[PDB]
Amino acid sequence: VVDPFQRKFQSIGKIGIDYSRPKKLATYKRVGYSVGLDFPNAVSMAGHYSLTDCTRAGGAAKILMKYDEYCAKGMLQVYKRSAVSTGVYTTKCTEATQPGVAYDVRVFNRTAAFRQAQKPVNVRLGEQYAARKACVTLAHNCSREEAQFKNMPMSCATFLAGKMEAMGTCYRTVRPSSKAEDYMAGSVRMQVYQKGNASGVYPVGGCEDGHAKGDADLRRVIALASEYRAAQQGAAAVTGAQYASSKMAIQLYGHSCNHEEGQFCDYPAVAAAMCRY
Amino acid sequence: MKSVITTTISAADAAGRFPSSSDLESIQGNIQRASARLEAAEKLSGNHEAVVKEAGDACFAKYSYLKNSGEAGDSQEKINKCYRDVDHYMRLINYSLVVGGTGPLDEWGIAGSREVYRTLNLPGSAYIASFTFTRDRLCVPRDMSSQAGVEFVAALDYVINSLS
Amino acid sequence: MKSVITTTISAADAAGRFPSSSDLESIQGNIQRASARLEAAEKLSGNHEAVVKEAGDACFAKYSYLKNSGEAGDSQEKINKCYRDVDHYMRLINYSLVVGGTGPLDEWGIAGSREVYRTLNLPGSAYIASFTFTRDRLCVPRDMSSQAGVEFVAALDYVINSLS
Amino acid sequence: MKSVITTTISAADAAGRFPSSSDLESIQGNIQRASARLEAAEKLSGNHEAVVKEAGDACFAKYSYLKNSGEAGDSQEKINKCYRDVDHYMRLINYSLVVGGTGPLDEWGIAGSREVYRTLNLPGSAYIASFTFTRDRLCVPRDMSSQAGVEFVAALDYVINSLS
Amino acid sequence: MLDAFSRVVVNSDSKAAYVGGSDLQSLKTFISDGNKRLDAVNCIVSNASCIVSDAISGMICENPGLIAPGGNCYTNRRMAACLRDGEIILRYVSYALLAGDSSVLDDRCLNGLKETYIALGVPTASTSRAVSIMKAASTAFIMNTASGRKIEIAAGDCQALQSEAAAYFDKVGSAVD
Amino acid sequence: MLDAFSRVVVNSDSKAAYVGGSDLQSLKTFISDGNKRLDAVNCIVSNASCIVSDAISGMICENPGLIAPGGNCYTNRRMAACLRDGEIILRYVSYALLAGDSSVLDDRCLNGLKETYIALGVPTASTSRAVSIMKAASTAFIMNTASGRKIEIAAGDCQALQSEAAAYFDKVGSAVD
Amino acid sequence: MLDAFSRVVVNSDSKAAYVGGSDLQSLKTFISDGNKRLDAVNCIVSNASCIVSDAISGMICENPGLIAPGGNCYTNRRMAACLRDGEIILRYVSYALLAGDSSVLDDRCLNGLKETYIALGVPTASTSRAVSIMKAASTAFIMNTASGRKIEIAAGDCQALQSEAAAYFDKVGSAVD
Numbered sequence A: 001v002v003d004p005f006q007r008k009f010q011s012i013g014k015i016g017i018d019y020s021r022p023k024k025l026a027t028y029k030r031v032g033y034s035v036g037l038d039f040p041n042a043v044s045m046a047g048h049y050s051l052t053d054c055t056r057a058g059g060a061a062k063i064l065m066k067y068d069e070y071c072a073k074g075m076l077q078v079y080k081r082s083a084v085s086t087g088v089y090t091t092k093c094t095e096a097t098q099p100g101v102a103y104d105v106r107v108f109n110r111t112a113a114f115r116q117a118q119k120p121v122n123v124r125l126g127e128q129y130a131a132r133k134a135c136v137t138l139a140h141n142c143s144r145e146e147a148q149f150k151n152m153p154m155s156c157a158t159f160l161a162g163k164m165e166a167m168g169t170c171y172r173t174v175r176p177s178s179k180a181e182d183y184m185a186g187s188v189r190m191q192v193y194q195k196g197n198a199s200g201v202y203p204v205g206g207c208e209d210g211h212a213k214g215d216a217d218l219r220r221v222i223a224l225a226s227e228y229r230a231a232q233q234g235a236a237a238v239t240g241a242q243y244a245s246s247k248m249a250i251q252l253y254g255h256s257c258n259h260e261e262g263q264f265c266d267y268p269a270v271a272a273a274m275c276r277y
Numbered sequence B, C, D: 001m002k003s004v005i006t007t008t009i010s011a012a013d014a015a016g017r018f019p020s021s022s023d024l025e026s027i028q029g030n031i032q033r034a035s036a037r038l039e040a041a042e043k044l045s046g047n048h049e050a051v052v053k054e055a056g057d058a059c060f061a062k063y064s065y066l067k068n069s070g071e072a073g074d075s076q077e078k079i080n081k082c083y084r085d086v087d088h089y090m091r092l093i094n095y096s097l098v099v100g101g102t103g104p105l106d107e108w109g110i111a112g113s114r115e116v117y118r119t120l121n122l123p124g125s126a127y128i129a130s131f132t133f134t135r136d137r138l139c140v141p142r143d144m145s146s147q148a149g150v151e152f153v154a155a156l157d158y159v160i161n162s163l164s
Numbered sequence E, F, G: 001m002l003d004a005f006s007r008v009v010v011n012s013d014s015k016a017a018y019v020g021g022s023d024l025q026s027l028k029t030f031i032s033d034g035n036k037r038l039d040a041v042n043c044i045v046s047n048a049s050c051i052v053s054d055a056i057s058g059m060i061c062e063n064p065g066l067i068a069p070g071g072n073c074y075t076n077r078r079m080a081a082c083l084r085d086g087e088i089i090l091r092y093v094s095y096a097l098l099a100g101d102s103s104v105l106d107d108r109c110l111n112g113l114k115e116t117y118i119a120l121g122v123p124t125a126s127t128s129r130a131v132s133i134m135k136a137a138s139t140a141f142i143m144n145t146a147s148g149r150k151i152e153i154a155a156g157d158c159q160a161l162q163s164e165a166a167a168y169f170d171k172v173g174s175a176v177d
């Protein structure tokens, strides 16, 4: 009636109507529900899946990949409600100074997600287990959550990034108040990136200011603009960001160790450098 | 505050653009709806006292157990407080009514009200009895213009649907 | 697309609120400015051919060196490319004019046009000669209604001020 | 669930260490406090029925306006629901009491209860009248052992101090 | 995210021509309609909380297996997740009412909801029943024939609009199954 | 971010009383003014690019030490930063024109600009000179007395409004120094 | 993460009733056991690193293709990742010993391990061999019959516990294959 192709891609009916011989368990694992994903718009959801498969129709686990996508986009919405709470956009989500910038922002973010997918398997496994372990530590004994982190690879990564955004505990949203916290904070960040890559050769993804020619300068300009908006913030915002960054980086990176617990509570911008993710 | 021109200027600021014709049409709708809800604001500043008085009197007319000696409002000072609270609510309806939008009301009255009212043993159903009393006593032609009255209805309903 | 109702719905959607009275007045201003813009859209779909023809003819009337045999537009096929590109521009002005705002025009015409025009040795000042020719040949009462005319002026100016 | 051994194993898992003597002493205190809590669990599984019956009867003995025809509990099915709701609560006090900690109670009973109770016009003071009735009817020597009784008191107080 | 306007514009862009006079006439039916839609959205968004509560309470009323232990409504956590889901559904429907096109509802909410409920074990029949109750309650409010609250509006014909809203809820109810 | 409405409201909230007819009367002057402000903002936002180009080019023209080596405009990088700064300033000025209150200009652009330029060694006198040129160009467009481009608009009185826009430029120029 | 206690509670919650006497009696066997499990965990957690060293060294000894070039254990980096994997395996096994239920081991470590080793090309039979040697070494330390280290304990029967720990290692070894 239909085709050989399309009947591979379709679906499966019921045992009473669509097929007589009672189908087995393997045929639900192999054909089943077939949906390929959208092209993903963030580095946090970029390296976890296939996106598509021309000439293959998987089933029953594509339910799970689809479910992780929808839970993960449900994650981003809420952590963006945090920056736009009163229905008026705060300075957190400005996304440009000049008129033509935002499209170039979109393209840089997009190809950064494609380069996040190009980096090899061992590295991405490393980041999956690291982020999984990190979400379990932020789960706070909630059992429902712990099931839903052991299974979800995307929801973990946007859970971490998302919470680092909405808490404001970022490296770029916190400005140190001294020259000692400048040098300490700088040194901490350097040591994090050196712990990531001891090869001495830049690794696909990572920082990557340059994709096409004339990117690097816009990167410099968007960076400085975000530094100026980071500078203009209120008292309330600053103090909340410092408490948040101190606590959060303690809960993730200070394990009843009075030295680092002290040097987090002492200087919060070092903690905000310790937040990473 | 959440309003028309602050949403559009906030969106142009978040986008990083010059304010195009879209924001101009938004503030066009603001300056066209304005006169109605400012008339409603004038009359609310007219007779807020009788609004609060009938609101609280009908509020304890429904819920008598509050002046019993468990529940909170069982002293003259706290009935003065219940009345004081409802006066703040009508003043916020006047403020957000002047502004346009729910921003003045939302950030002063609604945000964080759940922990305070839940903490201090305050039932929401008493407030809802007050507001629905005012909304049923409202009027179509006699005091106000009908159109502006609809604006008033909206704001009051927003309060109810932000409360429970 | 950037427009009135998509900015308000987008703002409510990002915030996660039900649509308050502020968005209602914004779409009220949309429905009030709408007829003026739509009529201008009708006339643009009317006589776009002569618009493009006078636009390009006056564009090469200002810049003759383009049909010299260095610079780009020096063959009949590329002067054809001139007229189709200006035709694209007027069609995007029609689109954005109908939508309301600059969203249709900006995302199709403006976004990344700088790399293409800068790469393929295309001068922007020739386009601006075309658009300013049309903007000076425009009219107050004779072809259009004054009000609607203003909306057209805005769109055309936007292109110029997005181009150089 | 939040408990002794899950806090310690969760802390060792988040830290990435072998389980040292500190967790061993924690589970030592678990296996030493265990008998007092378990005995209380036995007696709660003994007479939960009369606990719920006296709890709800004294709950509407205090608050009569609930069976009036405004407020919620004015129908036989919803008084059945108030009774079942308190039976769920005593069952969660038995579960948490057997586990050790408030983890079973917190993730089933408390988490998300604010939206539900605030939504469905449910006053907390009726629950608190029920639980404080049970806590005042409790006993020192006659039904239970004193020390285990204190455990019961703590869990019930936790429910009250997680409610309002 | 596309309104009426952007839908007409996209279709004319695929057709690669100017919008023209004819499409604009259907858009003049939209603009000429206008404050009917405004007052309608105001009606649904006014009584929104009450709709969500009644629809979900009705859904529990038809089968008490949900509140039975092991049912998906059995706990305070699951009940709250239930109510926020009803709320967000109603929210996007109202967004689609001002927009005039279902694009915001198709993109922002519909795209991957089925698979999500399938993977969480949410009974889809019961969800379409709740979407149906919100449909009936929302149409009754939008026509101002609601049995408890009946407010002053200048009279007229508003059936068209009710059919539009019914179309959006049938899109969600068809999507969740 | 506060418009003239929110300014009324905030002042009455500090006073802790109702809105009332006096403040509302001044607000009816604002609303009753209306399209003069609309058309004004349309004029400045239309010719914005050209204002920024002319103003900054004039600023370089009065003292060529900026383009001299060791001057702050000596490179394409510093010239670019210069151009974007003039553009952002004009952007926020137009925002303060739609708002009717300088709250958005005080919070989003003015808050920490002096400290910034002093930390970067930008000569403040040259910036106030460019803000002055943008002032004159913007008032000339807003009164439609621009000597190149003169578009048809209803003729009335628009002096008040010119004084408002001059107030905003004087606020920026007073702030940078 | 569910211990013995939470297993009893979850099973009684699926049964939807009170915990009951029968389950509490088995729980009194657990709690009444107690410091035998404490001393057992103390034994395995004491000699843990040395168990991991011996078991991985034996695993390389049975088939020298691991250390042969192109084998998984070739080079220092792979050998270090090998040693930390054996260490983390034993760590979660000891967590399952204090917990009394394998929920921590099923959720935190086992959930997606076979797929991971298949994606990395880790030979699963060699991992099951390593888990088997850790099983026998851990049972020999847990019964204090180890031929190198024999510490003083009050004597009695630890046989029941040893079956539990062997059940957890058989869960890991069955899971990796």
Ligand SMILES: *CCC1=C(C)C(=O)N[C@H]1Cc1[nH]c(/C=C2\N=C(C[C@H]3NC(=O)C(CC)=C3C)C(C)=C2CCC(=O)O)c(CCC(=O)O)c1C
Pocket: A193, A202, A206, A207, A208, A209, A216, A217, A219, A220, A221, A223, A224
């Ligand atoms: C965290 C990512 C990272 C690590 C680790 C590292 O060692 N350095 C970066 C990547 C990196 N970036 C460049 C090159 C340039 N990066 C910029 C952007 C910055 N310059 C600015 O002025 C500002 C705003 C204040 C920013 C954000 C620029 C402009 C360049 C030079 C561009 C060019 O045309 O060459 C490099 C290469 C240089 C190097 O560090 O060896 C690397 C590795």
Ligand SMILES: *CCC1=C(C)C(=O)N[C@H]1Cc1[nH]c(/C=C2\N=C(C[C@H]3NC(=O)C(CC)=C3C)C(C)=C2CCC(=O)O)c(CCC(=O)O)c1C
Pocket: E050, E051, E054, E057, E058, E061, E062, E133, E136, E137, E140, E141, E145, E146, E147, E148, E149
């Ligand atoms: C508080 C919200 C509200 C106001 C105010 C009001 O006037 N009525 C409601 C909204 C409303 N609800 C319906 C329709 C139905 N509502 C239910 C749910 C109830 N029916 C039950 O048996 C139970 C459990 C005992 C509940 C909670 C049902 C089943 C319907 C009819 C569904 C159908 O298929 O038609 C309406 C529309 C009817 C009307 O009142 O005009 C409204 C406005």
Ligand SMILES: *[C@@H](C)C1=C(C)C(=O)N[C@H]1Cc1[nH]c(/C=C2\N=C(C[C@H]3NC(=O)C(CC)=C3C)C(C)=C2CCC(=O)O)c(CCC(=O)O)c1C
Pocket: A041, A080, A081, A083, A084, A089, A092, A093, A094, A095, A102, A103, A105, A106, A107, A109, A110, B011, B014, B015, C002, C007, C010, C011, C014, C015, C106
């Ligand atoms: C910050 C987290 C934000 C919150 C909160 C929010 O509601 N939205 C964010 C800020 C925001 N962004 C825009 C406008 C644009 N943002 C763009 C960037 C994205 N577009 C892309 O294609 C990609 C790569 C896949 C990214 C990262 C672009 C482009 C725009 C539109 C630019 C334009 O010229 O208009 C806005 C305004 C739109 C709105 O949401 O109302 C806001 C508030």
Ligand SMILES: C=CC1=C(C)[C@@H](Cc2[nH]c(/C=C3N=C(/C=C4\NC(=O)[C@H](C)[C@H]4CC)C(C)=C\3CCC(=O)O)c(CCC(=O)O)c2C)NC1=O
Pocket: A040, A045, A046, A047, A048, A049, A050, A051, A052, A053, A054, A055, A056, A113, A114, A116, A117
């Ligand atoms: C951000 C960008 C981004 C991408 C571009 C993809 C790229 C990508 N594809 C796969 C994975 C895959 N990609 C394909 C696709 C193919 N099937 C074929 O018949 C064709 C040769 C080809 C389509 C043209 C298949 C079949 C797999 C699974 C391979 C397998 O498991 O054997 C994987 C490994 C993870 C997974 O299984 O999903 C990745 C990273 N993922 C991303 O995150």
Ligand SMILES: C=CC1=C(C)[C@@H](Cc2[nH]c(/C=C3N=C(/C=C4\NC(=O)[C@H](C)[C@H]4CC)C(C)=C\3CCC(=O)O)c(CCC(=O)O)c2C)NC1=O
Pocket: A071, A072, A074, A075, A078, A079, A141, A142, A143, A144, A145, A146, A148, A149, A155, A159, D106, D107, D111, D112
């Ligand atoms: C004692 C037990 C106990 C729990 C079980 C939790 C349950 C819980 N989670 C959240 C709150 C939250 N929980 C999640 C978790 C999720 N992110 C997703 O992508 C998934 C759908 C899901 C993990 C599987 C998120 C994202 C929030 C914040 C939601 C938001 O602010 O938008 C809140 C509100 C308070 C807060 O913000 O922390 C509560 C009570 N809390 C407790 O006290």
Ligand SMILES: C=CC1=C(C)[C@@H](Cc2[nH]c(/C=C3N=C(/C=C4\NC(=O)[C@H](C)[C@H]4CC)C(C)=C\3CCC(=O)O)c(CCC(=O)O)c2C)NC1=O
Pocket: A184, A185, A187, A188, A189, A191, A192, A195, A255, A256, A257, A258, A259, A260, A263, A264, A270, A274
């Ligand atoms: C300016 C302030 C400042 C700090 C406060 C530190 C904080 C810090 N510590 C580490 C890194 C580290 N810190 C510790 C310390 C710990 N060992 C334990 O047994 C305890 C839990 C804890 C001591 C109480 C260890 C062991 C590492 C290395 C972790 C590893 O590589 O596994 C790193 C990553 C870079 C590195 O490897 O050095 C950083 C940024 N660094 C700074 O620049």
Ligand SMILES: C=CC1=C(C)[C@@H](Cc2[nH]c(/C=C3N=C(/C=C4\NC(=O)[C@H](C)[C@H]4CC)C(C)=C\3CCC(=O)O)c(CCC(=O)O)c2C)NC1=O
Pocket: B059, B066, B072, B073, B074, B078, B079, B081, B082, B083, B085, B086, B088, B089, B108, B109, B116, B120, B122, B123, B126, B127
């Ligand atoms: C800007 C807006 C704004 C409001 C709306 C109020 C809301 C509000 N009310 C109270 C506080 C109070 N509000 C009431 C009112 C009540 N008495 C009852 O019998 C009824 C249930 C109810 C009136 C309908 C009472 C009694 C208190 C004191 C409660 C107590 O101390 O027990 C408090 C705590 C501070 C205080 O004690 O005053 C606040 C923030 N305050 C504000 O700033």
Ligand SMILES: C=CC1=C(C)[C@@H](Cc2[nH]c(/C=C3N=C(/C=C4\NC(=O)[C@H](C)[C@H]4CC)C(C)=C\3CCC(=O)O)c(CCC(=O)O)c2C)NC1=O
Pocket: C056, C059, C066, C072, C073, C074, C078, C079, C081, C082, C083, C085, C086, C088, C089, C108, C109, C116, C120, C122, C123, C126, C127
């Ligand atoms: C949707 C909107 C839209 C536009 C506005 C155009 C814009 C545009 N024009 C060209 C491309 C071109 N455009 C022109 C036009 C010019 N000839 C001259 O003498 C004048 C300077 C100028 C007319 C006024 C020419 C000649 C080319 C080809 C350039 C070349 O190949 O050298 C290209 C590259 C692709 C191509 O070769 O067609 C694009 C994107 N295209 C679009 O999709």
Ligand SMILES: C=CC1=C(C)[C@@H](Cc2[nH]c(/C=C3N=C(/C=C4\NC(=O)[C@H](C)[C@H]4CC)C(C)=C\3CCC(=O)O)c(CCC(=O)O)c2C)NC1=O
Pocket: D059, D066, D072, D073, D074, D078, D079, D081, D082, D083, D085, D086, D088, D089, D108, D109, D116, D120, D122, D123, D126, D127, E057, E060, E067, E073, E074, E075, E076, E079
């Ligand atoms: C796991 C724990 C757990 C609980 C503790 C309950 C809590 C709870 N109660 C109700 C729901 C309800 N609970 C009550 C109870 C009350 N009647 C009154 O007169 C008193 C104020 C109060 C008893 C003291 C009533 C009447 C309803 C129905 C409310 C309504 O539909 O109007 C609901 C909504 C679903 C439903 O209708 O059943 C929930 C989640 N459910 C759970 O799953």
Ligand SMILES: C=CC1=C(C)[C@@H](Cc2[nH]c(/C=C3N=C(/C=C4\NC(=O)[C@H](C)[C@H]4CC)C(C)=C\3CCC(=O)O)c(CCC(=O)O)c2C)NC1=O
Pocket: B033, B147, C021, C024, C025, C028, E033, E035, E036, E037, E038, E039, E040, E042, E142, E143, E144, E153, E154, E155, E156, E157, E158, E161
């Ligand atoms: C900013 C907020 C905002 C609103 C909420 C609306 C409110 C609104 N509705 C109408 C006007 C109207 N509103 C309705 C609506 C209906 N009548 C029925 O009997 C049905 C119950 C209901 C279906 C939706 C009708 C029929 C009219 C009159 C017909 C018309 O004007 O098209 C008018 C015209 C002026 C007047 O009547 O005085 C206005 C302003 N407009 C706005 O600007």
Ligand SMILES: C=CC1=C(C)[C@@H](Cc2[nH]c(/C=C3N=C(/C=C4\NC(=O)[C@H](C)[C@H]4CC)C(C)=C\3CCC(=O)O)c(CCC(=O)O)c2C)NC1=O
Pocket: D021, D024, D025, D028, G033, G035, G036, G037, G038, G039, G040, G041, G042, G043, G142, G143, G144, G153, G154, G155, G156, G157, G158, G161
């Ligand atoms: C905080 C740390 C901590 C520990 C490490 C344990 C240590 C510990 N073990 C026992 C006691 C004991 N420990 C063992 C253990 C065994 N005997 C064998 O022959 C086997 C080799 C081995 C299997 C595990 C036995 C058999 C007893 C005695 C029986 C019993 O008390 O149940 C006792 C009882 C008191 C005593 O003996 O003086 C204590 C405190 N408890 C703790 O609180």
Ligand SMILES: CCC1=C(C)/C(=C\C2=NC(=C\c3[nH]c(C[C@H]4NC(=O)C(C)=C4CC)c(C)c3CCC(=O)O)/C(CCC(=O)O)=C2C)NC1=O
Pocket: A076, A078, A079, A080, A082, A083, A092, A093, A094, A095, A096, A105, A161, A162, A164, A165, A166, A168, A169, A170, A171, A172, A222, A223, A226, A275, A276, A277
């Ligand atoms: C829900 C997430 C959220 C986000 C992503 C947010 C703001 C936000 N940060 C953004 C950017 C952005 N934010 C970060 C933050 C960051 N850097 C860190 O080291 C850590 C730990 C971070 C997380 C807080 C980076 C790396 C970027 C990419 C660099 C860049 O694009 O400039 C963007 C995109 C546009 C922009 O540059 O402003 C946005 C819109 N506000 C939020 O609430």
Ligand SMILES: CCC1=C(C)[C@@H](CC2=N/C(=C\c3[nH]c(C[C@@H]4NC(=O)C(C)=C4CC)c(C)c3CCC(=O)O)C(CCC(=O)O)=C2C)NC1=O
Pocket: F050, F051, F054, F055, F057, F058, F061, F132, F133, F136, F137, F140, F141, F145, F146, F147, F148, F149
């Ligand atoms: C030789 C180095 C040099 C320059 C460069 C100019 C720059 C310049 N433009 C001015 C001012 C100025 N500039 C313009 C904008 C400009 N005019 C237009 O009609 C159009 C279309 C424009 C952009 C293309 C306007 C509209 C004014 C206001 C005066 C007027 O009415 O023209 C002023 C007067 C400043 C003041 O009033 O304090 C100066 C100095 N002058 C110089 O000496």
Ligand SMILES: CCC1=C(C)[C@@H](CC2=N/C(=C\c3[nH]c(C[C@@H]4NC(=O)C(C)=C4CC)c(C)c3CCC(=O)O)C(CCC(=O)O)=C2C)NC1=O
Pocket: G050, G051, G053, G054, G055, G056, G057, G058, G059, G060, G061, G062, G132, G133, G136, G137, G140, G141, G145, G146, G147, G148, G149
């Ligand atoms: C040549 C390649 C090679 C190896 C490497 C070993 C590895 C090895 N150790 C074993 C088993 C084993 N290993 C140890 C641990 C070890 N012994 C101690 O006394 C101390 C202090 C230790 C760490 C330093 C113990 C305690 C046992 C149990 C047997 C015993 O009682 O010694 C077993 C028996 C496995 C079984 O029972 O199934 C093997 C195969 N064997 C090999 O053929």
